[PDB]
Amino acid sequence: DYYHATKTTIFNALLNTIDLSQLAQLDLKQAGEEIRDIVAELVAIKNVSMSVAEQEHLVQDIINDVLGYGPLEPLLARDDIADIMVNGAHRVFIEVGGKVQLTNVRFRDNLQLMNICQRIVSQVGRRVDESSPICDARLPDGSRVNVIAPPLALDGPTLTIRKFKKDKLTMKNLVEFASISPEGARVLGVIGACRCNLVISGGTGSGKTTLLNTMTAFIDPTERVVTCEDAAELQLQQPHVVRLETRPPNLEGSGAVTMRDLVKNCLRMRPERIIVGEVRGPEAFDLLQAMNTGHDGSMGTLHANSPREAISRIESMITMGGYGLPSKTIKEMIVGSVDVIIQAARLRDGSRRITHITEVVGLEGDVIVTQDLFVYEITGEDEHGKVVGKHRSTGIARPRFWDRARYYGLERELAEALDAAEA
Amino acid sequence: DYYHATKTTIFNALLNTIDLSQLAQLDLKQAGEEIRDIVAELVAIKNVSMSVAEQEHLVQDIINDVLGYGPLEPLLARDDIADIMVNGAHRVFIEVGGKVQLTNVRFRDNLQLMNICQRIVSQVGRRVDESSPICDARLPDGSRVNVIAPPLALDGPTLTIRKFKKDKLTMKNLVEFASISPEGARVLGVIGACRCNLVISGGTGSGKTTLLNTMTAFIDPTERVVTCEDAAELQLQQPHVVRLETRPPNLEGSGAVTMRDLVKNCLRMRPERIIVGEVRGPEAFDLLQAMNTGHDGSMGTLHANSPREAISRIESMITMGGYGLPSKTIKEMIVGSVDVIIQAARLRDGSRRITHITEVVGLEGDVIVTQDLFVYEITGEDEHGKVVGKHRSTGIARPRFWDRARYYGLERELAEALDAAEA
């Protein structure tokens, strides 16, 4: 029980010796030396029941007070903590492998929590305050963070940090997990190896990136690939790969490298596939040009619920780009570029599936035409609590991209898969 | 093996003797002499397995390290190497006639390579660094260099050097290799020198620029041609050629000269032709002015599949400018300006052919009319699967541009070619 009182006393001693009002003096290393020295002196002269390990913990606590995260660190250090939920200054919950509970860890004042949030979002050039009270971000270490500000959240700031995890699913494993039936697996293998301009839509918490990695695992080795990401998540398994990443705006908000610029420059490096981590703004435009001007195989992910919404969102982005294009031109361009859309989503019971495998057919006036090959038609739910479905097939005798399949001589296997699935 | 260690020892000896800070001290010949002598002496001062030939080779390597481009030079010195792609420090890809191969070449570290890239891009006044990590410029010798710095990239410095090809086909190659029969070839040759406007439409990868270059090959030498392009690709032999190029906008967002401004200005240089590299923005309207106000002989290229689709695209472009023109005056303008719309396409099988040599006849009501002279019809397939067809002339007697061709005494040749086609 001596931890809290002894810590308060030691903090007061350090402040009397070197107080935070002395900012710009006793810098990183100077602090790491002087604070530790004063802590050791206080422990020696001032009797404290804390041990050498406890002395080091108190030293680190003072260091945190100086430039720290706050009391999150003793939590983050663990591994069983799979989620950290703040919900104001007076509460911190955690999930521990299936169970969830409250914790006897708290903040002092909403200033402390607010400052900690501002700092942790400043780690990746993000700032949350009374002007932009919402901030979502992904820290470099891999885990994701979200924060809401006082003006909206009536309980002061609210913050959530989700533990990082690794999937690295493979197409041979997806079939066992019942994500896609084997006929679908072969069809997708053909669609991936055949350099088809596709777009992997997905809904909230659907898990697109895993699917995108699983699909790009089909590319032929020699092809010079080029990605454009914001977090460095993927793991390509090909020899000839070039990676990239944007650089957010500096503290002054200047000299930023938006994904648009990365794409516009990747257009000039002689790439064969321009994979993209996600689509957020007018960069879609450039990517669509890459989909069209002889870079056949470009992938990409955007946040949409169903394909006939994904198309509308693409059009809305292009319009927002501020180019002045009439809508009909945008529809013509999309119909020309895109070739396949794989819409994956999470059903009610929490599973993950692939609900649609659609092909853009053409334009007829002001309506785009789609010919969904597959649809995960829901059939029911079992007594054990998990939904049941089946991968029905519309069984089109010859999909649009048949020509490509021919050019690579893989058409026969695709035909076999269709025949099996058509029945 | 021992070349690495011997080179390391000799390089340390050279730095001790002459430091890179001594640049311009012991000027180029002076360096090649003094450093060579120092290396020769250190060969005996410090024992090494290198013989006299080894001494000379290591002297050359030291010289290249002092000023040279390093292991790039053995490649860049060659001619049968098209593109060089450097990712990281332990990977360099070279393109050799339509294929990529991974080099056995290496480097020392990433900072080495980054300084080398800075040297390479210094030649055009540009600068690449952590503050402007994107560089794209045309080296004076003609090649095009694009470099992305490791602040954006991950594996290391990203470098792409694209060499200017010198192999651009003439009509002879196209005719001989199943692109156009001696009928269409001679018709196009008559169309070229006859100073007839035209708008070459093309499909994805249909190879528009090659056709455009071949057509321009026939232009009259004594005409003041004034190209315009987004990136140097055309190659003309006429004595009188002014070449212009757009300037891509910089990251800061200022100092950009688009194709529109360039054509606006080319209208005021007393030209006698205009050859636009590709017509994408609204610049089409200005180009049409050149087709109209006594600059007969303009050209262009645009993206489309069907000549009617090409004309629809041109109307869309003209409307994009927002000048407020109605929808009928645009059609009047396009009917009075254009005089040939050639369509070249890529066969489904994986080969290219020239398809349409359509013209523009007039405006009947509110729709444009065409009188397609030549065509290419898909008979079927061979035992191997390649598409086959025939180049056919519909048999028109006096084309619209015939009157114009009357001036240049080509009429007899055109009549003869069409007659031979009709036979």
Side-chain angles (χ1 to χ4, degrees), chain A residues 91 108 117 158 164 192 241 261 269 302:
Chain A
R91 294 180 166 169
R108 194 186 59 181
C117 291
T158 67
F164 182 82
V241 173
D261 286 316
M269 291 173 54
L302 62 85

Side-chain angles (χ1 to χ4, degrees), chain B residues 75-193:
Chain B
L75 306 179
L76 286 185
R78 301 164 73 177
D79 300 6
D80 41 329
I81 285 169
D83 294 5
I84 283 177
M85 324 174 287
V86 188
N87 3 319
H90 311 343
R91 282 195 167 173
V92 168
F93 287 81
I94 53 177
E95 180 175 18
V96 177
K99 300 182 180 182
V100 310
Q101 61 180 353
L102 178 55
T103 51
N104 56 24
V105 185
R106 264 198 176 186
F107 275 97
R108 187 181 64 198
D109 65 315
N110 292 318
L111 183 61
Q112 157 203 35
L113 201 69
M114 197 61 191
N115 194 332
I116 290 172
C117 289
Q118 291 168 292
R119 285 188 190 178
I120 274 178
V121 304
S122 72
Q123 299 187 38
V124 299
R126 279 287 209 176
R127 52 174 184 176
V128 79
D129 53 64
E130 183 171 32
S131 308
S132 60
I134 318 185
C135 174
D136 181 277
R138 177 170 177 266
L139 286 174
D141 57 340
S143 61
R144 187 159 194 79
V145 178
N146 179 271
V147 170
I148 295 174
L152 294 186
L154 291 177
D155 295 5
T158 40
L159 165 72
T160 311
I161 286 170
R162 232 175 175 185
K163 291 176 169 296
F164 184 96
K165 322 102 180 64
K166 303 270 169 163
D167 55 357
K168 294 251 165 53
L169 315 176
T170 64
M171 187 56 58
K172 185 175 180 178
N173 292 320
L174 297 179
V175 177
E176 292 173 340
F177 304 156
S179 190
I180 188 65
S181 66
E183 295 68 352
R186 287 177 290 177
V187 170
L188 291 185
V190 174
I191 289 167

